[PDB]
Amino acid sequence: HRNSLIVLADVALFLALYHFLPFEHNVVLGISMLAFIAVLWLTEALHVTVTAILVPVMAVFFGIFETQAALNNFANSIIFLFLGGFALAAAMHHQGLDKVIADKVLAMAQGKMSVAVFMLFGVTALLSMWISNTATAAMMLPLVLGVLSKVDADKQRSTYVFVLLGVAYSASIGGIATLVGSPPNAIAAAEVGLSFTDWMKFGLPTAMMMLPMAIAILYFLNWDKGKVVTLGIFGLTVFLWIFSSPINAALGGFKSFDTLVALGAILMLSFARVVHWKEIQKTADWGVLLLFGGGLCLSNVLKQTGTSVFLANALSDMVSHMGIFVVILVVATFVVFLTEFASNTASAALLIPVFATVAEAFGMSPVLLSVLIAVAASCAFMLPVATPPNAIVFASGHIKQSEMMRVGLYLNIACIGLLTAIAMLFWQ
Amino acid sequence: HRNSLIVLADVALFLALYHFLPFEHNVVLGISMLAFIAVLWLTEALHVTVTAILVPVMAVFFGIFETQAALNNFANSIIFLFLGGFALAAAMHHQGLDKVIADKVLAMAQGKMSVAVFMLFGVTALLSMWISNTATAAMMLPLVLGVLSKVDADKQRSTYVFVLLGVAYSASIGGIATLVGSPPNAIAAAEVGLSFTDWMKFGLPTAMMMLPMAIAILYFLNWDKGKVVTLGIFGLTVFLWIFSSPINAALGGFKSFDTLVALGAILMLSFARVVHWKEIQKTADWGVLLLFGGGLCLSNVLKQTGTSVFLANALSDMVSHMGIFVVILVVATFVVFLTEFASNTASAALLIPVFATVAEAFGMSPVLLSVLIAVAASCAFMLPVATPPNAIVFASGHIKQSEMMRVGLYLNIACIGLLTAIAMLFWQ
Ligand code: NA
Numbered sequence: 084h085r086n087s088l089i090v091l092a093d094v095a096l097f098l099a100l101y102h103f104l105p106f107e108h109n110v111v112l113g114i115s116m117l118a119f120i121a122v123l124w125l126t127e128a129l130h131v132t133v134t135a136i137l138v139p140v141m142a143v144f145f146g147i148f149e150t151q152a153a154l155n156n157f158a159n160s161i162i163f164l165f166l167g168g169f170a171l172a173a174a175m176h177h178q179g180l181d182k183v184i185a186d187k188v189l190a191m192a193q194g195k196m197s198v199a200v201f202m203l204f205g206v207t208a209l210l211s212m213w214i215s216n217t218a219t220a221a222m223m224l225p226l227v228l229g230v231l232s233k234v235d236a237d238k239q240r241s242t243y244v245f246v247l248l249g250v251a252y253s254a255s256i257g258g259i260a261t262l263v264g265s266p267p268n269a270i271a272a273a274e275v276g277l278s279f280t281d282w283m284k285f286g287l288p289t290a291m292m293m294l295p296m297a298i299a300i301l302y303f304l305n306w307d308k309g310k311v312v313t314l315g316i317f318g319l320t321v322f323l324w325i326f327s328s329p330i331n332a333a334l335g336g337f338k339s340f341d342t343l344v345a346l347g348a349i350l351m352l353s354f355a356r357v358v359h360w361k362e363i364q365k366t367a368d369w370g371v372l373l374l375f376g377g378g379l380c381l382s383n384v385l386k387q388t389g390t391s392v393f394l395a396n397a398l399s400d401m402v403s404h405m406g407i408f409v410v411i412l413v414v415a416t417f418v419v420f421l422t423e424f425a426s427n428t429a430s431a432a433l434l435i436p437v438f439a440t441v442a443e444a445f446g447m448s449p450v451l452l453s454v455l456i457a458v459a460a461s462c463a464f465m466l467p468v469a470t471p472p473n474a475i476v477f478a479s480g481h482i483k484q485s486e487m488m489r490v491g492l493y494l495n496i497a498c499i500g501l502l503t504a505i506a507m508l509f510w511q
Numbered sequence: 512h513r514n515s516l517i518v519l520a521d522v523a524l525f526l527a528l529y530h531f532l533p534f535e536h537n538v539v540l541g542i543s544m545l546a547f548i549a550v551l552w553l554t555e556a557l558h559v560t561v562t563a564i565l566v567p568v569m570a571v572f573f574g575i576f577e578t579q580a581a582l583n584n585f586a587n588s589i590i591f592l593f594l595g596g597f598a599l600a601a602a603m604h605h606q607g608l609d610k611v612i613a614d615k616v617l618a619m620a621q622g623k624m625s626v627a628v629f630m631l632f633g634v635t636a637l638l639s640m641w642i643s644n645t646a647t648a649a650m651m652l653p654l655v656l657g658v659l660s661k662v663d664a665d666k667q668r669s670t671y672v673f674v675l676l677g678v679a680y681s682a683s684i685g686g687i688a689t690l691v692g693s694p695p696n697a698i699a700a701a702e703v704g705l706s707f708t709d710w711m712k713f714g715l716p717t718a719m720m721m722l723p724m725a726i727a728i729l730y731f732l733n734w735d736k737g738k739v740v741t742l743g744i745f746g747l748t749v750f751l752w753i754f755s756s757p758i759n760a761a762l763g764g765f766k767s768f769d770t771l772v773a774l775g776a777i778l779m780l781s782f783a784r785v786v787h788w789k790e791i792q793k794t795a796d797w798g799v800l801l802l803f804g805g806g807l808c809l810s811n812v813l814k815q816t817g818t819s820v821f822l823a824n825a826l827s828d829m830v831s832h833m834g835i836f837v838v839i840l841v842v843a844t845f846v847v848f849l850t851e852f853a854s855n856t857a858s859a860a861l862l863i864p865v866f867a868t869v870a871e872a873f874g875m876s877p878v879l880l881s882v883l884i885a886v887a888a889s890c891a892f893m894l895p896v897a898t899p900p901n902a903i904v905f906a907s908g909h910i911k912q913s914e915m916m917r918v919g920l921y922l923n924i925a926c927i928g929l930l931t932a933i934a935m936l937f938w939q
């Protein structure tokens with residue numbers, strides 16, 4: 084098989100770098116492992132989650148860590164914070180609160196199909212804030228192929244494809260609004276120790292910023308049992324997540340209050356009888372939760388082996404020849420196009436550790452580089468296979484490769500500017 | 512609703528015990544919480560897994576532990592060892608290696624129902640050694656309700672219930688053969704730190720004894736793509752699990768070698784392409800994996816609050832009036848009948864910590880009490896609702912409540928003897 088070969092080619096690459104690199108043995112091991120994992124996660128020869136499990140087993144066998152020490156990475160408080168958003172979404176999905184949120188809004192439009200399509204994007208993004216991106220796309224597709232029925236002029240495409248590629252992008256942009264939504268966001272918060280309210284001040288403005296800018300580029304070319312309870316619980320959870328900073332301070336200063344709030348939601352949602360656990364066990368993408376830990380284990384492997392300081396010293400002369408503007412532009416541009424070839428989270432899981440640890444060796448706040456990479460990782464708009472939402476609206480057998488390949492080439496450059504701009508403002 | 516009320520009745524008990532117990536505050540807090548959790552797990556008003564999530568959220572808010580410290584319990588090496596058994600079982604199910612194991616063996620018997628039923632039990636038990644009990648029961652029922660078709664005379668029931676209640680029991684006995692199989696086994700190994708080969712020396716001999724003794728009580732009343740590969744990995748894995756003790760010693764002494772082996776299997780099964788990850792995500796009962804951590808968190812809560820030594824001192828005069836024979840007999844008997852009313856795994860999560868920690872307060876190796884409790888938890892034979900296998904062969908609308916209610920009531924007494932005997936032999 085194709086992927087079965089990438090594994091063997093990666094094993095050879097490891098042995099080569101392991102035996103031939105003329106550096107301190109630990110740096111060789113750290114460099115070799117980093118290259119190994121990098122391939123397995125970008126090519127996906129092995130499932131993103133399978134590669135994550137391979138990270139600790141390597142560090143353990145090569146004396147980097149002891150068994151239990153390596154496994155402990157998979158229990159970060161952020162992982163449970165994301166699991167709360169899964170049970171929170173599963174709750175209002177099993178309850179049907181996502182469809183009713185679409186009807187009451189889609190029906191808010193009197194009957195104008197012209198202004199209806201615009202409302203389809205705003206919901207896909209708002210739903211992605213709490214549910215997901217692949218799921219938000221798969222859930223919106225049937226609701227998109229429903230409005231398109233009064234006038235199905237398949238020959239008329241400048242009024243037809245715009246609505247499909249829009250939701251595939253609104254789902255990806257909506258996931259950049261909150262810590263929950265896209266896995267990459269969680270990987271950043273877990274690396275630097277961000278709170279939920281910390282990441283919303285960053286991403287939400289960008290989501291508010293990037294959504295209109297994205298549409299412009301395309302343009303110019305019944306309340307039943309405890310649905311108020313689900314809303315009450317949901318509203319209460321989001322309220323604490325925003326006000327977690329002062330609430331926790333005025334309670335004794337609990338460590339990971341955002342995580343505590345997320346777990347309480349699972350309790351209220353289960354106490355309120357509104358969602359059964361078998362529902363939560365299905366909605367939660369346990370493979371992604373394992374990926375979170377796998378990325379942290381790799382990050383710690385870089386530190387314990389000194390690969391972070393070895394690469395920081397190697398890039399010392401290059402980053403000094405560049406300004407802070409030049410750096411974040413190369414990074415932003417590098418990822419904005421890299422995420423087009425590989426999975427969103429698979430890209431973030433690899434770059435967030437490398438950059439955050441090297442930036443930490445430079446005595447620089449790793450928040451900037453980390454949050455930036457997490458946002459640009461969700462900027463896959465060209466060809467499909469970049470993000471499932473892209474292949475979801477792409478599976479409609481209508482949108483052309485070259486059409487999307489060039490509309491995304493415009494949006495990509497557009498985002499690199501918006502990101503580098505906002506990234507420079509969030510400095511002093 | 513009933514369960515929503517059972518929760519409120521338990522909430523009152525906690526508040527009552529909280530303010531009224533006249534002991535040191537820590538003991539009061541530990542005592543109050545222990546009673547609270549005990550109810551939620553035996554009645555199952557909230558899903559066993561939902562109750563597990565409630566354990567840490569309490570310890571954090573009541574100052575027992577800090578957030579991250581509590582969550583780390585959910586990453587114990589045994590949990591990942593059990594996750595390996597899930598991907599190992601999920602592999603041979605999607606591949607069909609379990610079906611061929613039944614035919615090639617069931618076909619060894621030419622057509623004699625006498626040796627067919629006996630082979631039906633031996634396979635149901637051997638399959639439970641590695642897969643599960645609920646899954647093994649659901650997988651055997653069609654093969655049991657297919658052989659019992661030539662003798663369909665539901666008027667002839669003593670030749671029909673024997674084969675349904677027989678496999679429903681053989682599936683439960685098979686789960687006592689290896690560390691993987693029944694959650695209770697893992698809870699014991701995690702408390703006292705048992706290896707895979709350690710628990711097999713305990714359970715497997717007991718399984719060899721209990722299977723014939725169980726039948727006597729009932730009596731006296733094509734290899735395609737890589738199906739050998741699935742066996743090769745399985746065979747190789749089980750070979751390492753057995754010889755794990757010398758292999759690790761001859762490699763540098765890794766900490767949790769058994770856990771590493773389970774994770775390595777997940778890699779081979781994914782590298783060999785024999786099972787996709789989406790397959791593993793279905794089979795694994797993540798709710799049980801979350802339960803594992805909740806049970807360990809409780810064990811440490813008893814120590815940190817001194818409840819383990821507090822109960823040991825309270826039982827000092829009582830345990831001195833009793834011999835070691837009385838102890839292991841009282842314990843075994845209590846659970847063998849307790850598991851008839853509540854979930855099997857939920858019971859072990861409650862009693863294993865209490866006894867192992869109290870036994871530790873008595874300065875006694877908790878291995879004996881832990882392994883003992885873990886074995887008796889899988890002895891549910893009376894009414895249904897005790898174990899899914901009971902309600903699985905009972906949902907066949909043929910086996911009578913009184914029929915099973917008394918065959919298990921007799922089989923229960925039979926086990927209490929065998930266990931207390933072996934528990935005395937496994938002493939010195
Ligand atoms: Na991507």
Ligand code: NA
Binds near residue numbers: 640641682685687692
């Ligand atoms: Na089993």
Ligand code: NA
Binds near residue numbers: 851852891896898
């Ligand atoms: Na039970």
